[PDB]
Amino acid sequence: KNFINTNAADVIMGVAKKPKPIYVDKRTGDKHDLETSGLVPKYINKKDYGV
Amino acid sequence: LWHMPHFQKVGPHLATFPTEADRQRAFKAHREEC
Amino acid sequence: MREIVHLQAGQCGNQIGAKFWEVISDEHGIDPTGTYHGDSDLQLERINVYYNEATGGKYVPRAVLVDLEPGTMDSVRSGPFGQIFRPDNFVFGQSGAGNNWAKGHYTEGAELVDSVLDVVRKEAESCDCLQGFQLTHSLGGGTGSGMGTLLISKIREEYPDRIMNTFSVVPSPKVSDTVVEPYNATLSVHQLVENTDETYCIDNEALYDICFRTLKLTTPTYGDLNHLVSATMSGVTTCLRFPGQLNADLRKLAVNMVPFPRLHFFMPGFAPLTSRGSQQYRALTVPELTQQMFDAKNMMAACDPRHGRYLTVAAVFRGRMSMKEVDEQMLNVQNKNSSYFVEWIPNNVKTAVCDIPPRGLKMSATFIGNSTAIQELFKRISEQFTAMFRRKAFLHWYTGEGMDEMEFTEAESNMNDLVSEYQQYQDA
Amino acid sequence: MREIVHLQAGQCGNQIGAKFWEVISDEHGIDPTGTYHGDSDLQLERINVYYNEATGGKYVPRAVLVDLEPGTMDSVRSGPFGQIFRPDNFVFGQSGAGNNWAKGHYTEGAELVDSVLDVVRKEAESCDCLQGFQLTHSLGGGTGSGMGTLLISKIREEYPDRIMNTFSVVPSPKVSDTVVEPYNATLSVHQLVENTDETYCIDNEALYDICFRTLKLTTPTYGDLNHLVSATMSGVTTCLRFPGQLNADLRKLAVNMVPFPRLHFFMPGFAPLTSRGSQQYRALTVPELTQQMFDAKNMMAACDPRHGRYLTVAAVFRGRMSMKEVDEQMLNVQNKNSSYFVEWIPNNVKTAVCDIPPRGLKMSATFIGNSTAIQELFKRISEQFTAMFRRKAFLHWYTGEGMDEMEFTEAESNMNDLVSEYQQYQ
Amino acid sequence: MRECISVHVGQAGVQIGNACWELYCLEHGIQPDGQMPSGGDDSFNTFFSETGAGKHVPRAVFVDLEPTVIDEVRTGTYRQLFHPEQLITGKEDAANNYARGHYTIGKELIDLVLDRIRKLADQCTGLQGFLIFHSFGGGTGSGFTSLLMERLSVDYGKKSKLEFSIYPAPQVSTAVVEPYNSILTTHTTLEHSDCAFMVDNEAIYDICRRNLDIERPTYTNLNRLIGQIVSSITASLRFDGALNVDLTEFQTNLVPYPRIHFPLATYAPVISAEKAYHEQLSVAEITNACFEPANQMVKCDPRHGKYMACCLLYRGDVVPKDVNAAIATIKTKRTIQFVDWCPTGFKVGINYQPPTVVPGGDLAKVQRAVCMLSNTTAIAEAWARLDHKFDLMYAKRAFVHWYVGEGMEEGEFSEAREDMAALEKDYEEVGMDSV
Amino acid sequence: EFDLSDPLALKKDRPARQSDYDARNTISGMQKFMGEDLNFHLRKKFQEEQNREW
Amino acid sequence: ERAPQVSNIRTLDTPFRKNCSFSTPVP
Ligand SMILES: Nc1nc2c(ncn2[C@@H]2O[C@H](COP(=O)(O)OP(=O)(O)OP(=O)(O)O)[C@@H](O)[C@H]2O)c(=O)[nH]1
Ligand SMILES: Nc1nc2c(ncn2[C@@H]2O[C@H](COP(=O)(O)OP(=O)(O)O)[C@@H](O)[C@H]2O)c(=O)[nH]1
Ligand SMILES: Nc1nc2c(ncn2[C@@H]2O[C@H](COP(=O)(O)OP(=O)(O)O)[C@@H](O)[C@H]2O)c(=O)[nH]1
Ligand SMILES: [Mg+2]
Ligand SMILES: [Mg+2]
């Protein structure tokens, strides 16, 4: 087995890990989950909205 | 130095010379002293 | 805010870690009762990376103590720094592993892994931003290799994004003290390969050759070997703890050490290391520091790096020094000696400096080297294992505990695949 | 700047350089613990040539110290200046060769040459610009003649452009202490002709001849013999370490004064050697030093300056003086005596000076000279070797170590051309 | 007015920013506690501000992802000068990854940094532009400085954005995966940058070894020399001068073509105290040292290429006639080649105020000084060598799993090298004479 | 200058062990070791004596 | 000679005796 091509095939035929949206608000740094916090529209596009 | 055979056919982004006839003439004339 | 949870299993792992916490407590200025009693603010500013906080100004380590035999549990606290650790973190079994990888992984470690993990989740989830994990053990014993690889699997499935380190004492090539350590080493490479970001291979006779030829001890014991190993662990994470001109933490060196996610086996090394009789003849400067640093005698892995090619090299420095002369002669070792560095990476060597040296030196540095020649450490265990599997030497101690010959056949196959990994990247 | 590596081999090489590191450390100013206590500033500026630096003011000697048995290096570590040498430079084997060239070059030299070349590489890369290597050893031995020739081969192959020096103790015919001394010498020379640039042939007969007929000393020891050897070994290289009106380095003293790549066997000599009863009756000027330096008595090889034409001569003077006195004395020894020099080299005189003399002496010089009359140093040592090999005398102590008689055969083929190559200039 | 906002990103930007902001305090008399021991002088407002109570706070923002580079500033001798909210740290570093600095960890602090720059820009009555200090080799020094400028182009548009970038030196280097970061941060900055003043550590090392009588220089010596350059750049608008040069004029007189904006900065009166006693420093004599290849602060021979544009900034008691006679002799000199399509070549600027030494530094008391910022064709071989570094690591796809495995497509590498491989012919085309 | 302490012959300084039993090497420094028995002779002659009347 | 620096030292005659004051679970 040739492993020069195998390591390159894993990189070329692959996808990037999508990072979780998280936001800071401090000079000292703090990782707050952006999705669960009420700063991004999450439940405004629900199927039960308006009706 | 080595820059792979794959990164040799890549084209430029700038066309500063006014025409294409002088583009080949400028490149041919300066290989004479080098 | 960049802390790491310390893990340690096995008698070798507990004794190495016990000496490791002595070196750390000295450098940060922590007395055996656990109160900061040093001489500078820059020993307490980043005390939270290893030590927790208890009321009364007391600093409790984040290490969790693991063993299957309770004999070493009494030895750790009865040591000169044994009251420092939390008694709840002393989690242990009641029956020994008996140099069996099957008992540490399947039989005896199964009931104990659920108990230690609660203590691990205890000390990892109280962290605002955990940097990673660090487990020290050996690959010759039962609970060091068996449960030391089971614990690696459970942490990586729980914390995949966090880094994981392994300070593994892979078994010694020529001198030995266990007849089944080829079995335990073969079964413990495959778990190390797939679930660890840094692995530092440490050999006992490499430490013995250092104790003999470099240090000239009259009678070295296990305390001296754990002394030299503790130099690396404190030296590797020196940028997490103290300021530097150009610092490089635990994860940043990992990025430019491993070109591919499987070739993560390094050779440690401590540079400023001198016998008593040659102390007055040696001047503590950087050019002599970097010449002992790359010497094969100083290497804490008993494999000669001239037999292979250096894939990636790094060396983090400690002490007030000048950056120019570090940069020019670490270029020189690549230039005057260009045959043992891989041609497909132009600069193979990473530099980093900390301002604060260890207490006991004006200036210090350590060595981390990813060389091809660590394949000769592994394929010799393979020929030392294939002499035993063909005749089924001590196989009934393993297949009678819930294993089969297929697991040995695959574990030989992944180990032979890694020896095939380094050979192609050497030839390329 | 211009650092040079010291190397020693054999018990004879260990005794000589221990005396040499005694007189250099006396010269630059160094106590038995290696601390400067001199009375000048010119003594520390070129201390890098022979000494490294350590914390506290220490100057460890730039020397690697190897022998095949550890008994003689116990005395070196217990000598008057044995505490300056770094203990890592001490390289010793378990069992010595024991006056066996084959054992020194093939059997026990094999597992010790890796250790010395590691130390040599470690200490040569510390030099900013390594001016070369220089070794002192004996040619009648097993360590100096067997392994020391092996060391020269490896450090020449690894370090091509640097110059190589050696101070070989050629075994003496009339006074001798080794039966197999022709074997250890004729197996060493034909290696040493093609791997060295300067080979100083110091002989024990001439060192003895100086001690009686010049020093008038009643009971010489090996300290009194190595003192004369250490005097010329410091005097050859004195412009490398001290300023002068006309400087001359080691390469300067080599490339100028060897005419062909085989004519590199040399004749040392130290001029101002005076008797204690005749010291106060002797003046110290340029003319008295010139006449006595070229005399056949003060020669340091057991072959007179006479059996052949002087190929080239080099004199490295020392002290505060005027050059025309040096020039007129060289002029007055060429015009009055023009029959002992080659006629195809017309300007055959080399001069070299330093403003700083040796301690306790106003004026001094070191004579170096190529002459044909060193061919008898090889003809006579081969006429007794070919009288010994022809009956296969001591061959089982050599052929059983992994060598054959063809290596012996090419030794005489280099003992009938090197003497021959000397003889076409007659 | 004439306000300027400085952004220091990465460990390099902070360490240079420490030496930049100590020098700006000594040029104005602002003490480390932010009090001027004196409406008098208002020359500080280009760098500093006011709070009414006599406190001067820098118009700078300090961003890093590793806390232990800014935490010295928070607990150092200048702990009361900088606003705490202007010093910004994260939790984890970029780990020498452009992907971490751009896509995952750099996207963290970018909204807070943009917020802080807006509060700084709201206090600016007249804003000359943005100065950004980073290193091509660092993780956040390449990633976050790339994400910032894309956001500055969205938010501030055509506002002048100048960079002080630490180039990877062609032979001496620190990191291994450093050539990967250099290609990536060059590709996404070409259309967003306006001009990029470039300097590397190896060429300063030789200048510190030779021109100054200091053996084994430190990073602290390098940052003061860079700090003297940025001071010499801005002090035309800080101080009274004969020829005023502004930050907007640098992009016009040094960037002829949109995709080439990499001039080279040098500071020629850098001489030791022992060596300043012997030689005179005249205007003609110090401006020839701007053109010596050994005195260039970028390790590349300008004789290998051709000069495209030069920006001479004179600082001190320089006479404009001696400035003029000096440039005329350089034009008559044949070993310096200028391109045919730039017959002018030279922009000169003169400031009256002498450089003030840092008390206890390496630089000598020069009465006059000159700082040269020149765009040369000779930087093309630096890209050619930098191509030899990235590519020789990319043919085996080495060190890409750290990049492709975190937020970044592999096709980024398959587009970011081809675009900067076009710079090789862009520098070729501007280096051919028209017949 | 500011930094100094690298150039101008400051190499004349502490060898990091002036002698035995100094209070500065401690255990974080890697110069003192437990394996070197400075009383190896004195323990031996105690044991040489101890085997005699045994 | 290096016994204090092995389990808990209580046995005076032989300091190399075992001392499971620990282990021995509270149940
Ligand atoms: N001239 C100069 N260059 C510096 C200095 N400090 C760091 N550098 C350069 O910066 C490069 C590394 O980038 P840094 O800014 O230090 O690190 P970083 O930007 O924080 O990158 P990460 O820590 O990986 O996120 C090195 O290769 C150095 O060449 C300095 O003080 N002066
Ligand atoms: N370096 C070092 N190695 C040790 C130490 N103690 C044990 N070892 C190694 O660990 C191996 C055996 O480990 P073992 O006692 O069976 O660990 P267990 O699994 O806890 O029983 C031996 O080959 C030793 O070389 C120590 O203090 N230092
Ligand atoms: N000039 C001189 N010759 C010596 C001295 N010591 C020994 N020799 C000579 O060295 C020869 C023996 O060399 P040997 O014992 O084999 O040394 P080795 O070759 O290093 O093993 C003897 O014939 C002596 O004449 C000395 O102090 N001075
Ligand atoms: Mg000369
Ligand atoms: Mg950083």
Q: Calculate Rg over the CA atoms of chain C.
A: 21
CB C133 within 8 A of CB C154: no
Residues D244 and D382 in one domain: no
**Whether residue D160 sits in one domain with residue D127:** yes
Collapsing DSSP to helix, strand or coil, E184 comes out as: helix
Q: Report how far residue C223's alpha carbon sits from residue C15's, in angstroms, rounded to the nearest whole number.
A: 8
Closest to D156 in 3D by CA, of D167, D165, D143 = D165
Among D257, D291, D315, the domain-final residue is D257
Are residues D176 and D204 in contact, defined by beta-carbon separation less than 8 angstroms? no
Give the best residue of E70, E74, E112 to mutate against chain A (max A CB count within 10 A): E112
- Residue F24 burial (10 A CB sphere; 0-12, 13-18, 19+): middle
How many residues does this entry show for chain A?
A: 51
E139 within ligand 1 shell (Cβ under 6 A): yes
How do D364-371 and D310-318 pair as beta strands? antiparallel
Widest distance between CA atoms in chain A: 61
List CB contacts (< 8 A) between F15 and chain D: 54-56
| Range A31-37 contact pairs with CB under 8 angstroms and sequence separation of 24 or more | A31/C129, A31/E91, A31/E108
DSSP C162: S
Q: How far apart are CA E196 and CA E163, in angstroms?
A: 5
Shared domain for D386 and D290, answered yes or no, is: no
Burial of C327 (0-12, 13-18, 19+ CB in 10 A): buried
Beta carbons of C170 and C202 less than 8 angstroms apart: yes
Give the residues after which the backbone of chain F is interrupted, taking a C-to-next-N distance over 2.5 angstroms as a break: none
Q: How many domains does chain D have?
A: 3
**Coil, strand or helix at C347:** coil
Question: D182 and D218, same structural domain?
Answer: yes
| Residue A38: HSE in the Cβ half-sphere, 13 Å Cα cutoff | 0
Reduced 3-state DSSP string for E90-156:
CCCCCCCCHHHHHHHCHHHHHHHHHHHHHHHHCCCCCEEEEEEEEECCCCCCCCHHHHHHHHHHHHC
Q: Cα–Cα distance between E261 and E255 in angstroms, integer?
A: 5
Q: Quick one: three-class SS letters along chain D?
A: CCCEEEEECHHHHHHHHHHHHHHHHHHHCCCCCCCCCCCCCCCCCCCCCCECCECCCECCECEEEEECCCHHHHHHHCCCCCCCCCHHHEEECCCCCCCCHHHHHHHCCCCCHHHHHHHHHHHHCCCCCCCEEEEEEECCCCHHHHHHHHHHHHHHHHCCCCEEEEEEEECCCCCCCCCCHHHHHHHHHHHHCCCCCEEEEEEHHHHHHHHHHCCCCCCCCHHHHHHHHHHHHHHCCHHHCCCCCCCCCHHHHHHCCCCCCCCCEECEEECCCCCCCCCCCCCCCHHHHHHHHCCHHHCCCCCCCCCCCEEEEEEEEECCCCHHHHHHHHHHHHHHCCCCECCCCCCCCCEECCCCCCCCCCCEEEEEEEEHHHCHHHHHHHHCCHHHHCCCCCCHHHHCCCCCHHHHHHHHHHCCCHHHHHHCCC
Query: In units of Å, what resolution does this entry have?
Result: 3.5
Stretch (H or E) spanning E348: strand E346-351
Q: How many whole angstroms from its chain centre is CA E160? A: 14
For tokens 């290998």, what's the residue? E304
**C356 and C232 in one domain?**
no
Cβ–Cβ < 8 Å for E54, E109: no
- The answer for residues whose C-beta is within 8 angstroms of residue E65's C-beta and 6 or more apart is E89, E90, E91, E92, E93, E94, E100, E101, E105, E106, E109, E139, E140, E144
Q: Which of D236, D257, D278 is the last residue of a domain?
A: D257
CATH code, domain carrying D279:
3.30.1330.20
Q: How far is C56 from chain A (nearest CA, A)?
A: 26
Cα C149 to Cα C76, C104, C154, C194, distances in angstroms: 22, 9, 9, 11
CB distance E166 to ligand 1 below 6 Å: yes
Q: What pairs with residue D138 in β-bridges?
A: D169
Do D101 and D232 fall into the same domain?
Answer: yes
Alpha carbons C280 and C277: distance in angstroms, whole number: 7
Q: Phi and psi at residue C137, in whole multiples of 5°?
A: -165, -170
Does the annotation count E249 as an active-site position?
Answer: yes
Give me the CATH number covering residue C206: 3.40.50.1440
- Which helix (H) or strand (E) covers residue C265, if one does? strand C265-270
Taking the C-alpha atoms of residue D273 and residue D212, their distance in angstroms, rounded to an integer, is 11
Burial class from Cβ neighbours inside 10 Å (0-12, 13-18, 19+) for residue D41 reads: exposed
With the CA atoms of D97, D101, D106 and D112 taken in that order, what torsion angle do they form, in degrees rounded to the nearest 10?
A: 50
Q: Which is nearest to D366 in space by CA: D283, D273, D277, D269?
A: D269
Q: Which ranges constitute the DSSP H helices of E270-317?
A: 273-276, 283-287
CB atoms within 5 A of ion ligand 5 belong to: E 11, 66
Do C50 and C90 belong to one domain? yes
| Contact call for residues D166 and D135 (beta carbons, < 8 A) | yes
Candidate from D8, D12, D19, D92 with most ligand 3 atoms within 8 A of CB, to mutate: D12
Helix then strand count (H, E) for chain C reads: 15, 10
Cα E240 from Cα D160, distance rounded (Å): 63
- Give the structural domain span for C110: 3-257
For residues D147 and D186, membership in a common domain is answered with yes
Q: Which of D290, D421, D303, D276 is nearest to D360 (CA)?
A: D276
Which stretches does DSSP call E strand in C35-155? 64-67, 90-92, 130-138
**In a shared domain, residues C205 and C339:** no
**Ligand index nearest the alpha carbon of residue C142:** 2
Whether chain A has a CB inside 8 Å of the CB on C279: the answer is no
N-term to C-term CA, chain A:
61
Q: How was this structure determined?
A: cryo-EM
Residue C275 to residues C212, C268, C270, D227, D347: CA-CA distances in angstroms?
Answer: 9, 19, 14, 34, 56
Are E109 and A26 in contact, with CB atoms under 8 Å apart?
no
b/e code D140-173 from CB counts within 10 Å (16+ = b): bbbbbbbbbbbbbeebbeebeebbbbbbbbbbbb
Alpha helices in E320-398 (DSSP H): 320-332, 380-394
CATH of the domain at C414: 1.10.287.600
Q: What residues contact residue A7 under an 8 Å CB cut-off, 6+ apart?
A: C260, E396, E397
Q: Does E189 show up as a binding residue in the annotation?
A: no
For F52, what's the count of Cα atoms within 13 Å in the CB-facing half-sphere? Answer: 6
Closest residue by Cα to residue E140 from E168, E180, E106, E179: E106
Separation between Cα atoms, residue E2 and residue E247, nearest integer Å: 10
- List CB contacts (< 8 A) between G5 and chain F: 34
- Strand C163-169, strand D268-270: pairing: unpaired
Q: At which of C257, C274, C293 does a domain end?
A: C257
Same domain, D343 and D419: no
Would you tell me the crossing angle of helices E413-429 and E380-394 to the nearest 10 degrees?
160
CA angle in degrees (0–180, nearest 5) for C71-C76-C77 = 110
Residue E12 Cα, ligand 1 centroid: separation in angstroms? 4
CA distance C358 to C354: 10
Q: Answer whether C13 contacts ligand 2 (Cβ < 6 A).
A: no
Phi, psi of C318 (to 5 degrees): -130, 135
CA distance C255 to D2: 43
Q: What is the DSSP letter of C88?
A: G
Q: Are residues D251 and D194 in the same domain?
A: yes
Neighbours of chain G (3+ CB pairs under 8 A): C, F
E strand or H helix that includes residue C191: helix C181-194
Asked if residue E112 lies in contact with residue E88, where contact means CB atoms within 8 angstroms, the answer is yes
Same domain? For C322 and C397 the reply is: no
What is the greatest pairwise CA distance in chain C? Answer: 62
Q: How many CA atoms lie within 13 A of D423 on its CB side?
A: 11
End-to-end Cα spacing for chain B? 18
Output phi, psi for C395, to 5 deg: -75, -30
How far apart, in whole angstroms, are the C-alpha atoms of residue E43 and residue E37? Answer: 15
Is E95 a pocket residue for ligand 1 (Cβ < 6 Å)?
Answer: yes
Angle between helices E10-26 and E67-74 (to 10 degrees): 20
